[PDB]
Amino acid sequence: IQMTQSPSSLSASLGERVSLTCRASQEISGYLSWLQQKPDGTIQRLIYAAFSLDSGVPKRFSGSRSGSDYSLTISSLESEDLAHYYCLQYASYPCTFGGGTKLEI
Amino acid sequence: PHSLGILHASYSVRQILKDVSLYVESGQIMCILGSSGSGKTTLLDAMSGRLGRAGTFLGEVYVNGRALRREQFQDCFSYVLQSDTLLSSLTVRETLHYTALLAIRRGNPGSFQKKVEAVMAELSLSHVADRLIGNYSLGGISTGERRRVSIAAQLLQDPKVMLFDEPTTGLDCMTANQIVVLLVELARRNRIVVLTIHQPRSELFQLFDKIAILSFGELIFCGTPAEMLDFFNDCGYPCPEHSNPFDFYMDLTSVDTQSKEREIETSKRVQMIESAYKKSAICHKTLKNIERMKHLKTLPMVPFKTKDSPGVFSKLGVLLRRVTRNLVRNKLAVITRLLQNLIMGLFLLFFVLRVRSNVLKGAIQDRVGLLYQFVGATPYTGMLNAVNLFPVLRAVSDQESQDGLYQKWQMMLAYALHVLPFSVVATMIFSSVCYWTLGLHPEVARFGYFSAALLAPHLIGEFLTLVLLGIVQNPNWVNSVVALLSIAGVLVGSGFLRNIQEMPIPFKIISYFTFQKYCSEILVVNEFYGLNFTCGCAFTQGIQFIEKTCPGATSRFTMNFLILYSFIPALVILGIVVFKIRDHLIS
Amino acid sequence: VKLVESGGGLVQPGGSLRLSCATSGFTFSEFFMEWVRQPPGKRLEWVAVSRNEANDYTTDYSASVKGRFIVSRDTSQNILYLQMNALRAEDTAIYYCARDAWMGFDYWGQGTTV
Amino acid sequence: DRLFSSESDNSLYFTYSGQPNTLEVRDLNYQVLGIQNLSFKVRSGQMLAIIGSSGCGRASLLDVITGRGHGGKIKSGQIWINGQPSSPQLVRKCVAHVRQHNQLLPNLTVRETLAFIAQMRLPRTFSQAQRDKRVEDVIAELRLRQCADTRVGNMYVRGLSGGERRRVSIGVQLLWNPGILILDEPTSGLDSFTAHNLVKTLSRLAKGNRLVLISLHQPRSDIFRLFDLVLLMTSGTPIYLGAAQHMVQYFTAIGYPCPRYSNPADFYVDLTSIDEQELATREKAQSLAALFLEKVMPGAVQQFTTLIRRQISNDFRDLPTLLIHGAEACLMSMTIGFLYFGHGSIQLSFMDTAALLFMIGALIPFNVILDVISKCYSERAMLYYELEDGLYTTGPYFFAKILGELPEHCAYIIIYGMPTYWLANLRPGLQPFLLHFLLVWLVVFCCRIMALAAAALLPTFHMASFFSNALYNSFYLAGGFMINLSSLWTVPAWISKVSFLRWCFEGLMKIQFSRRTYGDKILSVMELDSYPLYAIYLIVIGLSGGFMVLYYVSLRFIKQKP
């Protein structure tokens, strides 16, 4: 299963509503995760199962699904959002990742 | 010796067969394996010449050097189905004699009996020659014996090229092995046998002379089992020890439709095996043998069947005698046929039990209720009988009409002819038991008129249910539709509960095409004519109620009887047409 | 939960290296242990997996490192080990230490440059 | 082994945590084929595959081991489960059974039915998060994550594949974490690759500290190659018991070599298969049999809520059935309205209105009986299996079925009664219309309950339909419109006294003809003035309650065998 993430790069201002699109080649039935790789190197999971949120994650991150397109919506973007985002699937072996999206303020 | 040759066979109407090339000779038996969507049944139907009307079939079929056309397939190729639809209340000898009479026409029954005895001795059926078929679980003959009887009935026409559609599916291991050995012997007795097996055993590998594998209509391999092992070892897939080479070579040439990559891998492997087979010497030798047989002109003439079908009247009489013997030998069938109306009348008598013709509280009410119940129950009983006894004969006719024995409309006509007297006797005894006990205008002429007016709708409903069974496969749907139609007819056409002189125009027009209206008019004229009423009270006589329900029915009594009795042949003709469409909408 | 990666450095092609993943804050004997690498200009790629005690500590590798990489775990100190052989050809990455893959990649580590 | 799919995950996500379960059978001798001196012992972590004649008629060997059985019951041996004697409570608490025929609702998805089974299986102490985690673990263990949202529809419905249906059934039977798993013909009707994948999944499940028993009549070569332990059964007696790979070496050591290019299972089955020839082949199987021996929570309210929710979710998603029901109801209503059309120059007479009311009362029970019997017999087997599994004690199931069928019944009543009272130009007003609607609703509900009771009382579909039609005809003839309700001596009078059709006709007559005659004289000349309207309503309610009691007793005492 190939995970195509769009767009490859995104630039927005503080407070803008950012939405990242991830498409799966097959049906994962909502088994999708969103990773945030900070510029320092430490990665942290923000949204699992494409709908729920992890502990300590701000409520600004939300996950939605429209047909076969999963969307990660970030409202009220702050300065701590400059990082890379990778969508992955864990419904079929092996677990594949996405192309990635560099979100810069 | 004979030889069958298939060259570049293809069946599109979505490309079910792609370049099928087979070549069988006399004394050899060829087995064909494949997956669910392999298309071996389509190949067998194209060889037998049955499914050729649905879609175009390319390629040539050479037999003994002569190319058979699209119409000579049913005259040289025999086809044994898998349903195995046989009459339970019939012996093996009688069934084979009826089959020989429907197929061959020679003369005195001595030659037919000799042929039946020889065919039974060929398949070792003499020990069950005088036994009813019945059911294998109810004490009759086993499934293998039923398959042997079917093979005997197919061999009665003396074929030379036989086709079998999964003869081992549905049986146990020992019976399947016995059937395989029997087919091998039949092929070795100067004949050609081409059968298909879903999943053979391990001991059936060295018994066949040629083994074919089909995958989505593409011929993967066709040759000797030893040559099969040699080719599969040269291709780089040696058969492991204790691996059932049949299942191994079936899984090696299969398509795994589970994921998006395994399917592509299996398709690539199948294509590689097919390309390696097309370049092998086995296919080249097969093509060379086909081309040599095509341009040899030394083999004998094409072996056709033994004789043509006899006249239509002879076949109709044979089918009538067959269905009569099948009905008489089944006690339950005739018991229900003769007692359904009797139980219905007894159930009505348990409630009514009398008509008080000297009180005006429920006299007209009881009479109207009894007439309504009769008119609504007689077609129901006819439909019950039809749904209970026809589907087996319908399946037998559908199985035996594709071989060129007879037509389905002849079977329907024979069924009608054999159902006429039993229904007549049932209605007569029911009326003799219930008409006099209820005390409904005791008289002989009224008794006969009531008997006729209750016998006609029974036959009408039975023939309507016959038509619907000929046009609809599911018997429960036919039952429900006939029940709804009978309810609607007895509710609209009958002037008991609607007063037709007041109903709207569309319903008034619909009521003219229903037999319930004429039945109710006849019953009213026969009942409320020669008796008076007393309340001790709208009315005082019966003529007033007659004029209220149906005014001009007294002068049209005979016309209503004529229409009721003429409604029968129209339904028979409609059923003939329905069957002449059914024999075209299935194949 | 806390993951600390170590053991990265400069190695020659065809040599041998061993990475160390320290675990703290959770039971090391009931959760999986996964190695995820990241090329300098590509996406994330799962490398190997070391199952829990219920699977008898069995291991599994991807189709690209099957035969050259050996992953193991020490239950006495709760430290994951990844023995890499015939490396530096194209396996230079930022290898990370993950906890669970079937239940979503959660609680990632810091990663080290190999 | 290289021709099948190999890019799978060999991880175990849902294992059995606890003491290893055992199963020891000692000299089992079944009677009415002919099991003689059966003895084996398996532990957790082994997969026992019973090949050959694994049946004794209508019941398989695993049904005898679990204590079930359709045929005989007289035993002659002992069965030890986890060191304890066999008992229905023990086999219900520890042993899980996966039948050959699946019992899954087509209108439900995998996740929904798995959550329902987990809620009906797990105790009330487990929170919702624990149930969700258990469902996710069951889904991940059987690799059902790519189809967790697709429906599990049966034939004539899209649904999913057959192997996925078998996996969903295994997950349903595995949600409560059983110690011993038992499946009857799991690879029946599946593809070769699908059967191989299912056998691999069952082996992985058995490897996770579990005991899995499999019955297979004719196993293939690739399926027999994956067997851990095998038990050859021919005509009830055991021939071999041990490793599958060592069967050939054992038969060769006892003087029966397997030929090259021949499956071992089929060869050893047809070598000792029972056929003057029957006695010759019987001693051969007896010789090998003797040779083998010498060498060796949550509660009633929660269950009711879960059942009614599952029934509502399954019924409100079946669009074709609801469409056919609405079409039949609309057709009947239009026919009744246009046949007795009262608007125009000629108005309806007295007898015409009486016949109209009688038809309105007595025409719907036919279709009602048909639909209810069909719906009951389409899930009788599932209900029997769920009752034998031990989820609910058929107490709350009655109320669940009633309150799940009530909305569809009310919608059908609305559709059948709306275009019927206005087209016939009956008594105008709101109170008479509401009374007619309520009476029709109560009568159709009573008929529905009678149909449910007749379906639960008789095991045969045709026999139940015949009994329902007989009762319907007895209630139809007993009505006050056909036989005048006065020409009844002793039996038809008492039949009419308990006939809901007669009470419906009398109620409709008293509603339409009271003080609206063109007076009470029209009912005084008839026999429909001896019971007031509220008395008729109370009698209908009492008949409904009696039919409900009969249906409950039949559900509690009579087994709903398929």
Shape of chain D: elongated
User: How big a fraction of the residues of chain D is strand?
Assistant: 5-15%
State the helicity of chain D in percent bands.
40-55%
What is the CA-atom radius of gyration of chain B, in angstroms? 31 Å
Please tally the β strands of chain B and state the result: 10
**Gross CATH architecture of the domain at 22-295 in chain D:** 3-Layer(aba) Sandwich
Most extensive interface: pair and counts? B-D, 56 and 57 residues
Strand order of the largest sheet of chain D: 6-7-8-3-9-10
Total helical segments of chain B: 19
Give helix and strand order of chain B, one letter per element, not per position: EEEHEEEHHHEHEEEHHHHHHHHHHHHHH
Q: Could you estimate the helical fraction of the residues of chain B in percent? A: 40-55%
CATH superfamily label of the domain at 22-295 in chain D: P-loop containing nucleotide triphosphate hydrolases
The biggest sheet of chain B amounts to:
6 strands, mixed
* Quaternary structure annotation: heterotetramer
Please state the structural category of chain B. Answer: alpha/beta
State the name of the first-level CATH class of the domain at 22-295 in chain D.
Answer: Alpha Beta
Q: Give the terminus-to-terminus CA distance of chain B.
A: 33 Å
Subcellular location (chain D): Cell membrane; Apical cell membrane
Subunit structure (chain D): Heterodimer with ABCG8.
Family (chain D): Belongs to the ABC transporter superfamily. ABCG family. Eye pigment precursor importer (TC 3.A.1.204) subfamily.
Domain ABC transporter (chain D): 23-260
